[PDB]
């Protein structure tokens, strides 16, 4: 009886996984106990699935979908478009045409969405498209990636349209980090507003939630959720973790209260938040290394004092 069961009347609890998390008994016992949603940490990203034009690799992603199919869990599909882990070929030495690009993007999205539409319930369609903060008013709100350089903001719209065609029943999200920062969260809102007003097919906003001990206050996070709440009916925390920096009893206490504060805020917003997904299973497999003591499971795949606090609430 784990996390998922505790938050059953609030929202799903999920976890990004790697090949070994769904292949090793000791880790599998944990994942099934605690979570009712799964994200591929890497296996559905654009370079991992299409490292050359038209040459799809489904090996790693299939294992993970397999695991979900079998245990009656639905997946989040992480991501269809992103300026990282992407094959240069999609957008180029020279940049390609809007049209040659849209085709590479349409071909890719449509394949992958169709392939896993039976397990994926939602898709992080575009990732990290909004620009980092300091944006001096009037200057471009979006990150100047190659895709933007070719399409401008239009490529995001196409990506959401292309994925909607391939599966009309999936919830399609825009996903980003520094989601609770005022300026950036305002920019995110602006983007999604534009899409809503144009009638582009977006459903939800993905809050990465790469937080830390000193980074955002609970006010900031509760604010951004209200702001986002007024443009979309679906919010996921998508890659949650709380790094201690930027091994003491004190730091451990600090991280504990944040996690406890954070889940108080999200419980209040149960009705718009459908999912809270931790970025890795345990500190062992955290992308931030174990130095950062970032998750509710320690390097032995065992719960920390913080685990019981978050779980035994009310």
Axis-axis angle for helices 218-229, 249-268 (nearest 10): 20
- Pick the catalytic residue: 239, 246, 251, 299? 239
Residues forming a β-bridge with 207:
176, 237
Closest CA to 266 of 228, 212, 308: 228
Distance (Å, whole) CA 101 – CA 90: 6
DSSP 117: T
Closest CA to 225 of 262, 260, 191: 262
Structural domain spans, the chain: 1-314
Burial of 110 from C-beta contacts in 10 A (0-12 / 13-18 / 19+):
middle
Distance (Å, whole) CA 286 – CA 192: 30
CATH topology for 1-314 is TIM Barrel (3.20.20)
Query: CB neighbours of 208 closer than 8 A, spacing ≥ 6?
Result: 175, 176, 177, 178, 179, 237, 238, 239, 240
Q: Annotated catalytic, 239?
A: yes
3-state DSSP assignment of residue 274: strand
CB 225 within 8 A of CB 273: yes
Q: Within the chain, where are the H helices?
A: 3-6, 25-34, 46-49, 59-71, 98-116, 146-151, 154-166, 182-198, 218-229, 249-268, 305-311
Q: Annotated catalytic, 181?
A: no
Rg, C-alpha atoms of the chain: 19
- Pick the catalytic residue: 41, 50, 128, 181? 128
3-state DSSP assignment of residue 21: helix
């Amino acid at each position: 009886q784990g996390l998922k069961d505790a938050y059953k009347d609030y929202f799903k609890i999920g976890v990004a996984v790697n090949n070994r998390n769904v292949a090793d008994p000791d880790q599998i016992k944990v994942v099934l106990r605690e979570f009712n949603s799964i994200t591929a940490e890497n296996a559905m990203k654009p370079q991992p699935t299409e490292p050359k034009k038209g040459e799809f690799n489904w090996e790693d992603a299939d294992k993970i979908a397999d695991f979900c199919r079998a245990n009656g869990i639905k997946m989040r599909g992480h991501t269809l478009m992103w300026h990282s882990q992407i094959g240069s070929w999609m957008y180029q030495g020279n940049l390609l045409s809007k049209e040659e690009f849209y085709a590479n993007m349409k071909h890719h999205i449509q394949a992958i969405v169709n392939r896993y539409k039976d397990v994926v319930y939602c898709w992080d369609v575009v990732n990290e498209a909004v620009a980092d903060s300091p944006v001096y008013p009037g200057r471009p709100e979006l990150r100047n990636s190659p895709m933007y350089q070719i399409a401008g903001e239009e490529f995001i719209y196409k990506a959401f349209e292309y994925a909607h065609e391939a599966d009309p029943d999936a919830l399609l999200f825009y996903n980003d980090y520094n989601d609770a920062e005022p300026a950036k969260s305002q920019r995110i809102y602006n983007l999604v507003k534009r899409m809503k007003d144009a009638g582009v097919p977006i459903d939800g906003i993905g809050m990465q939630a790469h937080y830390n001990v000193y980074g955002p206050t609970m006010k900031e996070v509760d604010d951004a959720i209200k702001l986002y709440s007024t443009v979309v009916d679906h919010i996921h925390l998508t890659e949650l973790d709380i790094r201690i920096n930027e091994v003491s009893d004190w730091e451990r206490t600090l991280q504990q209260d944040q996690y406890v504060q954070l889940f108080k805020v999200l419980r209040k917003h149960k009705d718009v938040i459908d999912c809270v997904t931790f970025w890795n299973v345990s500190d062992k497999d955290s992308w931030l290394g174990v130095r950062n003591y970032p998750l509710l499971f320690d390097e032995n795949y065992k719960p920390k004092q913080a685990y019981n606090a978050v779980k035994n609430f009310d």
